[PDB]
Short mmCIF file of C-alpha atoms and ligand atoms in Angstrom, two decimals:
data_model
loop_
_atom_site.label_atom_id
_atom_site.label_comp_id
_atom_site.label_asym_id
_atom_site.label_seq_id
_atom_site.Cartn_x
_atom_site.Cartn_y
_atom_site.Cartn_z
CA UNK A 9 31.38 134.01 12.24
CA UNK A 10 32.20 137.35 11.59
CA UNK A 11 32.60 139.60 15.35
CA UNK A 12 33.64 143.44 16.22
CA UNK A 13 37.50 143.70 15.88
CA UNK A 14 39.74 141.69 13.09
CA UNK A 15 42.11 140.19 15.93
CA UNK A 16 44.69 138.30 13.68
CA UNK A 17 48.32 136.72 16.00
CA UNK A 18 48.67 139.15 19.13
CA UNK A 19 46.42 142.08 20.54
CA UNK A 20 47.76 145.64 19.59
CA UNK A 21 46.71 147.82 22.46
CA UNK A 22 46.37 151.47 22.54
CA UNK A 23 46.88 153.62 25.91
CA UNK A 24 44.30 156.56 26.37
CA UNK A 25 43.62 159.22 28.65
CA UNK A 26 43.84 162.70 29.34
CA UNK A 27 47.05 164.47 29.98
CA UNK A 28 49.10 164.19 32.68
CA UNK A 29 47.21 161.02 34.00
CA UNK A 30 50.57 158.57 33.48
CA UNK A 31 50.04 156.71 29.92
CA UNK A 32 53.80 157.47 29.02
CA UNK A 33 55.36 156.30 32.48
CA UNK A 34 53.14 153.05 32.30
CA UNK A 35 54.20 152.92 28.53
CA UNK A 36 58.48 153.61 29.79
CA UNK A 37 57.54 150.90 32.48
CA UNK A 38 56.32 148.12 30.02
CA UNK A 39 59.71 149.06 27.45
CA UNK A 40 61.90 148.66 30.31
CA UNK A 41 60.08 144.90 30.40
CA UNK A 42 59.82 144.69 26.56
CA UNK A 43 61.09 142.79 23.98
CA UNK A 44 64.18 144.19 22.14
CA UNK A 45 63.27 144.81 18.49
CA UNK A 46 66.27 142.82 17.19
CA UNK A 47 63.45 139.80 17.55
CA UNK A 48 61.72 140.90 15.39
CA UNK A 49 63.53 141.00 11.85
CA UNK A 50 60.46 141.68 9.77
CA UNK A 51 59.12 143.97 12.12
CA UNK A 52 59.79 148.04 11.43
CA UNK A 53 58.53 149.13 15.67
CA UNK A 54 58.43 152.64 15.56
CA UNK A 55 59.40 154.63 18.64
CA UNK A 56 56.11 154.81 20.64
CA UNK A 57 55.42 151.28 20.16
CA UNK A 58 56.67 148.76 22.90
CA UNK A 59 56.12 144.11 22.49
CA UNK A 60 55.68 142.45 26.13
CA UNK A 61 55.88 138.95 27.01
CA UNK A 62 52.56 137.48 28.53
CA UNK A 63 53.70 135.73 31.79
CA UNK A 64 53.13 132.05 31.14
CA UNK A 65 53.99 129.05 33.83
CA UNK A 66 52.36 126.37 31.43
CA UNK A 67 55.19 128.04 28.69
CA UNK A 68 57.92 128.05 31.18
CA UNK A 69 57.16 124.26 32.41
CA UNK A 70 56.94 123.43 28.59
CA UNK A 71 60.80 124.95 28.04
CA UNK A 72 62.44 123.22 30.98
CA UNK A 73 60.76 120.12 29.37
CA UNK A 74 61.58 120.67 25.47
CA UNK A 75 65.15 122.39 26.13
CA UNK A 76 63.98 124.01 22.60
CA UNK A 77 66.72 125.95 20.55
CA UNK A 78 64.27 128.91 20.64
CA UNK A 79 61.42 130.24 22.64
CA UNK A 80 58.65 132.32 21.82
CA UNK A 81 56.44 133.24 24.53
CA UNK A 82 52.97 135.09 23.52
CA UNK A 83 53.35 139.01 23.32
CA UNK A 84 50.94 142.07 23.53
CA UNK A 85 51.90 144.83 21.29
CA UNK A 86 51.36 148.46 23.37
CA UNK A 87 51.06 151.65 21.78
CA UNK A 88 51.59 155.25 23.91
CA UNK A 89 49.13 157.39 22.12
CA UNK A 90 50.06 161.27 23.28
CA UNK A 91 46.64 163.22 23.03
CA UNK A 92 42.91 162.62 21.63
CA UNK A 93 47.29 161.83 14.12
CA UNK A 94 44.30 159.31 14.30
CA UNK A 95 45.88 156.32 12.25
CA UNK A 96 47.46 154.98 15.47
CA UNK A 97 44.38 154.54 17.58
CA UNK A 98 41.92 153.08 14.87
CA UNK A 99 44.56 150.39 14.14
CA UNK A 100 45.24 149.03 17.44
CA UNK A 101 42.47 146.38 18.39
CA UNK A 102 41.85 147.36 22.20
CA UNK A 103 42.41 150.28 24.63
CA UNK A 104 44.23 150.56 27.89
CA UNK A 105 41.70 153.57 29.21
CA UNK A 106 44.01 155.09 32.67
CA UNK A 107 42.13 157.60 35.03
CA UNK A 108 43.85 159.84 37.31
CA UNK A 109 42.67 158.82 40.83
CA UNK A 110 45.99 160.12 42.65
CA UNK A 111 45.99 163.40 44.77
CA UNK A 112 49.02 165.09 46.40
CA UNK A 113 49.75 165.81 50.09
CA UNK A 114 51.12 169.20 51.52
CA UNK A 115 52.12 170.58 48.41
CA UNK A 116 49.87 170.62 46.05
CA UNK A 117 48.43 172.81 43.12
CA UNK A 118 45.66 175.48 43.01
CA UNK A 119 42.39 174.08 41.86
CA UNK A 120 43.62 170.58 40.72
CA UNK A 121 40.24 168.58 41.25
CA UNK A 122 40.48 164.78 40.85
CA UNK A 123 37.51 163.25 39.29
CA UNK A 124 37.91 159.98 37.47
CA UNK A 125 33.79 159.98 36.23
CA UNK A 126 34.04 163.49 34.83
CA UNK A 127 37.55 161.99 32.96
CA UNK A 128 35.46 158.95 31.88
CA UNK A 129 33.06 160.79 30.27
CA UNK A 130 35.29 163.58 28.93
CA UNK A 131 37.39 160.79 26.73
CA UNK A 132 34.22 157.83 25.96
CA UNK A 133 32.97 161.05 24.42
CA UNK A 134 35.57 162.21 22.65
CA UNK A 135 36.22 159.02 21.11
CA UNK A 136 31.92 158.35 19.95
CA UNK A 137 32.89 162.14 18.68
CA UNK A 138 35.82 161.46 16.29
CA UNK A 139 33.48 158.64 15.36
CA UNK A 140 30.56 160.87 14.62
CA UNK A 141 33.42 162.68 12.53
CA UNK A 142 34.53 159.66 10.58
CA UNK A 143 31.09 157.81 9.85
CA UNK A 144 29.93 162.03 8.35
CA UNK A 145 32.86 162.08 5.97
CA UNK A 146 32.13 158.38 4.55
CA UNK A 147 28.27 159.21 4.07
CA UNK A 148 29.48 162.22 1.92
CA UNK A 149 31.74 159.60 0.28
CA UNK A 150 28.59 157.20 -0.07
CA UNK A 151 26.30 159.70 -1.08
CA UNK A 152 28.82 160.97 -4.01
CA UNK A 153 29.32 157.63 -4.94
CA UNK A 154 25.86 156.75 -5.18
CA UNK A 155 25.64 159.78 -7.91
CA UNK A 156 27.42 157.61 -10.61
CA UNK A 157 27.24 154.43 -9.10
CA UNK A 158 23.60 151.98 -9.22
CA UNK A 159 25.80 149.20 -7.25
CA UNK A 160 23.56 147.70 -4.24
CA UNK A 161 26.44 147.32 -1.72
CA UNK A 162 26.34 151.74 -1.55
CA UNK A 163 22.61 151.30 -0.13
CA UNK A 164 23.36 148.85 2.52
CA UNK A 165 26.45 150.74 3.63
CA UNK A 166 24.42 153.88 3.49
CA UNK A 167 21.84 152.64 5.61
CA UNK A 168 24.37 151.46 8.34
CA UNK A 169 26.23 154.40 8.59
CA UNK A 170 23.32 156.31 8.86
CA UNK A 171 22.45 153.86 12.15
CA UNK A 172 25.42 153.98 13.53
CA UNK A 173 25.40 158.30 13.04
CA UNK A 174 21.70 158.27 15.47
CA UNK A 175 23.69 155.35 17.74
CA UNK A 176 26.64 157.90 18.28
CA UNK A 177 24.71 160.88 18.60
CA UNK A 178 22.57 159.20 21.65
CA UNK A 179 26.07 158.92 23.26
CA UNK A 180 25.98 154.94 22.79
CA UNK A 181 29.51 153.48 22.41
CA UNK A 182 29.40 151.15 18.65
CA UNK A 183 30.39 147.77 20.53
CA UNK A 184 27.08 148.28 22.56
CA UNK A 185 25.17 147.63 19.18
CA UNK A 186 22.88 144.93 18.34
CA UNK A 187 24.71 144.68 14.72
CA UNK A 188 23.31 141.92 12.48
CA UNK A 189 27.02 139.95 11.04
CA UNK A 190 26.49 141.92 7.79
CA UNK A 191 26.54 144.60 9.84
CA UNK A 192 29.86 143.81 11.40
CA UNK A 193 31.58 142.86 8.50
CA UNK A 194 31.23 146.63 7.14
CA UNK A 195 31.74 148.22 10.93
CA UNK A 196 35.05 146.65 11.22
CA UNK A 197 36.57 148.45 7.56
CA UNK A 198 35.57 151.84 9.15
CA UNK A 199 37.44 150.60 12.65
CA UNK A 200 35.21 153.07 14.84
CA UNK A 201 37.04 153.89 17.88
CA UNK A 202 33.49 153.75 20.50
CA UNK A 203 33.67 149.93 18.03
CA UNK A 204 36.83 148.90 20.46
CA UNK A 205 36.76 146.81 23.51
CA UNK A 206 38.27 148.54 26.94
CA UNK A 207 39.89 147.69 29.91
CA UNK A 208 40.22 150.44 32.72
CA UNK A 209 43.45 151.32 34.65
CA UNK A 210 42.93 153.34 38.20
CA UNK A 211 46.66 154.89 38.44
CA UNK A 212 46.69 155.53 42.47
CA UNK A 213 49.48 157.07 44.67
CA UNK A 214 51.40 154.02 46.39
CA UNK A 215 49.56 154.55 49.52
CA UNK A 216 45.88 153.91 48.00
CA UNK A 217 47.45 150.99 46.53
CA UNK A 218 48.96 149.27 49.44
CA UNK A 219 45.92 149.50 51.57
CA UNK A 220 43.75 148.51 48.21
CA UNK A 221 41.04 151.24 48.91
CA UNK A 222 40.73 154.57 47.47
CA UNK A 223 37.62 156.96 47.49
CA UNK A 224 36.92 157.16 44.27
CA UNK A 225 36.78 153.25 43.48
CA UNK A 226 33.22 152.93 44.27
CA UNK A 227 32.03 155.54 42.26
CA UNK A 228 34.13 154.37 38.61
CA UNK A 229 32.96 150.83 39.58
CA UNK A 230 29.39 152.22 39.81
CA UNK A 231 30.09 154.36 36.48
CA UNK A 232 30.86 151.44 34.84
CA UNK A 233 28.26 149.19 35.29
CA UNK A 234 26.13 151.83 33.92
CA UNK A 235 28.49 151.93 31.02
CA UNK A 236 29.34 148.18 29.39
CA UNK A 237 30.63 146.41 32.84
CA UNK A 238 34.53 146.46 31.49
CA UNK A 239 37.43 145.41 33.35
CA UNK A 240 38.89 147.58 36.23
CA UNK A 241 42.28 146.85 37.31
CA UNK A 242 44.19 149.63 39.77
CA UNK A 243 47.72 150.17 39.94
CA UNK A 244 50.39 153.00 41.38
CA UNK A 245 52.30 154.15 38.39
CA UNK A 246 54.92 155.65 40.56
CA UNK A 247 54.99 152.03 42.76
CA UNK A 248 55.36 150.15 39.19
CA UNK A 249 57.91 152.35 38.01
CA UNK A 250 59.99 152.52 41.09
CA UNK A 251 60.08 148.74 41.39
CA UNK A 252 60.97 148.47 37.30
CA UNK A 253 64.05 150.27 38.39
CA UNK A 254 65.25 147.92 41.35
CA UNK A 255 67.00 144.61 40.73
CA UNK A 256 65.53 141.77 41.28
CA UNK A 257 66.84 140.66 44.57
CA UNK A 258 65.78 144.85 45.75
CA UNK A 259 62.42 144.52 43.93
CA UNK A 260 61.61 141.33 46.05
CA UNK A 261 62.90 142.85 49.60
CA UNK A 262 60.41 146.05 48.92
CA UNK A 263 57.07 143.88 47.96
CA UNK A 264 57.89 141.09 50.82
CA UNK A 265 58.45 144.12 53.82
CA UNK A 266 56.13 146.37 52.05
CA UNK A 267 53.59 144.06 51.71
CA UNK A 268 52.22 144.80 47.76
CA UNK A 269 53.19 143.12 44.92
CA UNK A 270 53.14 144.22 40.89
CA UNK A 271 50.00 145.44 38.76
CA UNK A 272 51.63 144.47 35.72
CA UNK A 273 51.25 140.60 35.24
CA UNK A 274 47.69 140.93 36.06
CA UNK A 275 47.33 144.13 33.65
CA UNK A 276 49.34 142.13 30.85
CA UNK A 277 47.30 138.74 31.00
CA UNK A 278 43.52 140.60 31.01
CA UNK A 279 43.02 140.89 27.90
CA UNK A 280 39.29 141.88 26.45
CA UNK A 281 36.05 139.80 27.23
CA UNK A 282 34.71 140.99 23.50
CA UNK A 283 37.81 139.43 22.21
CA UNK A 284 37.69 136.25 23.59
CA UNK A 285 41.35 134.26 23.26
CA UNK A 286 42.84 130.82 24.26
CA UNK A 287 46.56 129.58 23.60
CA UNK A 288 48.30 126.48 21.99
CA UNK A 289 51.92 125.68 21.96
CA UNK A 290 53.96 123.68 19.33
CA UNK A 291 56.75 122.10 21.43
CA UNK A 292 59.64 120.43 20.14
CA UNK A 293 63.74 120.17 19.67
CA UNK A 294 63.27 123.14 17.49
CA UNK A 295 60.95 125.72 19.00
CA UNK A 296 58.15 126.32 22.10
CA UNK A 297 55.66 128.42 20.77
CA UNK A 298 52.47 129.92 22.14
CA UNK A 299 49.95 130.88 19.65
CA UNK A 300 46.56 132.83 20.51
CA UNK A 301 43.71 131.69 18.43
CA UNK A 302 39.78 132.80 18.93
CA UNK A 303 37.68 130.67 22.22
CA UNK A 304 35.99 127.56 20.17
CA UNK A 305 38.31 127.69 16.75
CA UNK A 306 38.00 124.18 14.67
CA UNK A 307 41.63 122.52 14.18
CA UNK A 308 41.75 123.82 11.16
CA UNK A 309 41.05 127.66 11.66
CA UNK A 310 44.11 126.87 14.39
CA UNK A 311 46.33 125.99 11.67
CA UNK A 312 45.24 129.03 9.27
CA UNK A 313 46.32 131.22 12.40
CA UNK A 314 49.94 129.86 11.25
CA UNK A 315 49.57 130.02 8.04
CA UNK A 316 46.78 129.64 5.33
CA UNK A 317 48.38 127.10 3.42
CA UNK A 318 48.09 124.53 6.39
CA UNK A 319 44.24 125.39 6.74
CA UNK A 320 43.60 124.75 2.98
CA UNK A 321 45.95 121.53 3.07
CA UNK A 322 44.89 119.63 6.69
CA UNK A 323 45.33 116.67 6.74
CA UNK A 324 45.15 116.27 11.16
CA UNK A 325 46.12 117.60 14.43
CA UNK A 326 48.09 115.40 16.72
CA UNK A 327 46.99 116.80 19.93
CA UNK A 328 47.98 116.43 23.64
CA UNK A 329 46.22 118.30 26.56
CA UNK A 330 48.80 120.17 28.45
CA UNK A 331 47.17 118.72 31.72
CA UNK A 332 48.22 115.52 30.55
CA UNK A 333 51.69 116.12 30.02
CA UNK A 334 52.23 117.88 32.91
CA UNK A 335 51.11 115.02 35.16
CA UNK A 336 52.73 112.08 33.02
CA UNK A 337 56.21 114.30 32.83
CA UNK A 338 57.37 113.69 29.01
CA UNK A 339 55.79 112.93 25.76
CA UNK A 340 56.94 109.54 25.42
CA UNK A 341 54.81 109.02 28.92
CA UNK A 342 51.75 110.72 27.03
CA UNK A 343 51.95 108.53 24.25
CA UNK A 344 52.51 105.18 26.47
CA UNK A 345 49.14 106.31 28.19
CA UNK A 346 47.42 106.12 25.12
CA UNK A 347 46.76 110.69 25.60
CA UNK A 348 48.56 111.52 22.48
CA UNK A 349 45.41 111.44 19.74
CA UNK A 350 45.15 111.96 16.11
CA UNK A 351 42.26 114.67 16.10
CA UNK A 352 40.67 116.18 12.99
CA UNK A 353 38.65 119.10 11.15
CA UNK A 354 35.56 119.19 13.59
CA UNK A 355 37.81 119.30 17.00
CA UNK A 356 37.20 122.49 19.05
CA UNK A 357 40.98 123.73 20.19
CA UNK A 358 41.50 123.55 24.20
CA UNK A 359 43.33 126.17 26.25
CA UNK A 360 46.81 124.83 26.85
CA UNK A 361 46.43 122.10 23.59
CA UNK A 362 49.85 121.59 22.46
CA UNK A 363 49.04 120.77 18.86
CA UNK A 364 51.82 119.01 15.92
CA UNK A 365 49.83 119.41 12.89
CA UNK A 366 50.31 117.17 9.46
CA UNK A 367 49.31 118.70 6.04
CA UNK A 368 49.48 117.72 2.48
CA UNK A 369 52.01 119.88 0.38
CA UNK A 370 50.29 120.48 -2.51
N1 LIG B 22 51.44 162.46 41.31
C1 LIG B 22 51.50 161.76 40.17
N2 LIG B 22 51.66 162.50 39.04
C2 LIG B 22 51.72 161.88 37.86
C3 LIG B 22 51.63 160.42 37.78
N3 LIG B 22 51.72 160.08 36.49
C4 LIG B 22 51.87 161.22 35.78
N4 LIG B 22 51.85 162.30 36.62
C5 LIG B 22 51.97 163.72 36.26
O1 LIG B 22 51.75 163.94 34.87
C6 LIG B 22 53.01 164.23 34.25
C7 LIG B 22 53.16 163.49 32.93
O2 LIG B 22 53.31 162.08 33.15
P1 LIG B 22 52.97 161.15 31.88
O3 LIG B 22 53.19 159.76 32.38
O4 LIG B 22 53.71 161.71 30.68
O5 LIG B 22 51.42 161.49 31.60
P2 LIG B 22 50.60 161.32 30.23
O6 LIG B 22 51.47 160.51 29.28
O7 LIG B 22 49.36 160.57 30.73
O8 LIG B 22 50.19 162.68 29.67
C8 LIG B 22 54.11 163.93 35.26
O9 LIG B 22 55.25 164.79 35.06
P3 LIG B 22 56.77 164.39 35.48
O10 LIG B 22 57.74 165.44 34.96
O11 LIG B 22 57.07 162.96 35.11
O12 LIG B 22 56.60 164.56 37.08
P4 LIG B 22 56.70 166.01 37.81
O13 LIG B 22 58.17 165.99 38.17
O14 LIG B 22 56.32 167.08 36.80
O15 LIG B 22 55.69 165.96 38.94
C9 LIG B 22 53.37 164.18 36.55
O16 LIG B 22 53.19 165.56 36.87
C10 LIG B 22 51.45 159.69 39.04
O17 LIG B 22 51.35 158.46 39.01
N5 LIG B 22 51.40 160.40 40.20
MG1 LIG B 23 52.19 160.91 27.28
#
């Protein structure tokens, strides 16, 4: 039950690098696509802190079909982190690791050697390092603790955080651990950095990009097999941010005749393999919804994700598979065909499920 990384209603992603590698003109790309923060009415979003919708056709298809009064696509939540002052990075629940693989042309700068593998291992260190940092201060904590206190829980954490000092120190990334879940459960209060799942983005010069080849590919692939086997994606910053600019009848024009199309869907809608995610929808007069929930959650633990109270008070899940509806055209079709079932604590949520759930009040 418990896993690495408390994921809760969306993922909160943090952007690392080194300098000068394009994290803030990916970040001013994804705000020019953003959500404006009047949406959000509960919601303080400070400045370097940007909500994007994830690109959904079954969503779409379900709002020409509903007509709802509102619609509320899923969203990633994207922080810009400037350098590697810590709280932002140990909240967010994944990383956005870019490289540098982009060189200039006839004017270039003295000395300025690319080398995305001597990058990767400059930052994965730095972060098992500020980890290393971290896990020494709450031993001395521990250890101080342990002067006045007999409790049994100061042993166990002891002993962990002891483990997890010799894991970091052998240059092994946390989320590489064989952790027991007792194990986990402690990890994620300390939110160790080397603890969070990664996908990699390969900025490239337009040119690399178009032709989909670049030197240097081979040799981060290779790098990262080595190292966990995480998600690559490239992209052109400069390509992406260029085409952000255009309208969309330009934007359109340049991919068709230029023959490349946007990184950005793709780069939105990854996600993390150690954070494994499906979506439901509630669909009706009122509202279209998609809500991300954890691969194999119980009906249930779907309704907790909106709110305890209808986890605690189930009563059933009145579910149709989006598959279904899609084929049939309209819910009264579904329900005609006999595809509209009462389903109840022990169903497994489907991808796609679009779920109206009944609960008892008190
Ligand atoms: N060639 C190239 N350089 C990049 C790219 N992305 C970033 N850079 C270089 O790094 C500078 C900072 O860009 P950011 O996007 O802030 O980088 P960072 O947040 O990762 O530190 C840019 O300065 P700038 O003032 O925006 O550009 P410049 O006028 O100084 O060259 C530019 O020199 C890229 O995709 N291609
Ligand atoms: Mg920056």
């Amino acid at each position: 039950r418990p896993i690495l990384g408390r994921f809760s209603s969306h993922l909160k992603i943090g952007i690392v690098g080194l300098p000068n590698v394009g994290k803030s003109t990916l970040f001013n790309t994804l705000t020019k696509l953003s959500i404006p923060a009047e949406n959000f009415p509960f919601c303080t979003i400070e400045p370097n802190e940007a909500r994007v919708n994830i690109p959904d056709e079954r969503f779409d298809w379900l709002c020409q079909t509903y007509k709802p009064k509102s619609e509320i696509p899923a969203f990633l939540e994207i922080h810009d982190i400037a350098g590697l002052f810590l709280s932002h990075i140990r909240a967010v629940d994944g990383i956005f690791h870019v490289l540098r693989a982009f060189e200039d042309a006839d004017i270039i700068h003295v000395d300025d050697i690319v080398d995305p593998v001597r990058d990767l291992e400059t930052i994965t260190e730095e972060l098992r390092l500020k980890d290393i940092e971290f896990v020494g201060k709450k031993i001395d904590d521990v250890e101080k603790s342990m002067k006045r206190s007999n409790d049994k829980q100061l042993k166990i954490e002891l002993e962990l955080l002891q483990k997890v000092k010799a894991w970091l120190e052998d240059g092994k990334d946390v989320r590489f651990g064989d952790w027991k879940t007792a194990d986990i459960e402690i990890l994620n209060t300390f939110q160790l950095l080397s603890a969070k799942p990664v996908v990699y983005l390969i900025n490239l010069n337009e040119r690399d990009y178009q032709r989909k080849k670049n030197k240097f590919l081979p040799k981060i692939h290779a790098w990262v097999q080595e190292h966990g086997g995480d998600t690559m994606i490239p992209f052109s910053g400069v390509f992406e941010r260029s085409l952000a600019d255009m309208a969309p009848d330009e934007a359109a024009k340049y991919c068709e005749e230029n023959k490349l199309q946007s990184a950005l869907p793709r780069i939105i809608k990854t996600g993390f393999s150690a954070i494994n995610l499906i979506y439901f929808f509630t669909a009706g007069p009122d509202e279209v919804k998609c809500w991300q929930i954890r691969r194999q959650s119980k009906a249930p633990q779907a309704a907790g994700a909106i709110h305890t109270d209808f986890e605690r008070g189930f009563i059933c899940a009145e579910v149709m598979k989006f598959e279904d509806l899609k084929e049939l055209g309209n819910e009264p079709a579904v329900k005609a065909a006999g595809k509209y079932r009462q389903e109840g604590k022990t169903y497994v949520v489907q991808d796609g499920d679009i779920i109206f759930f009944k609960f008892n009040v008190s």
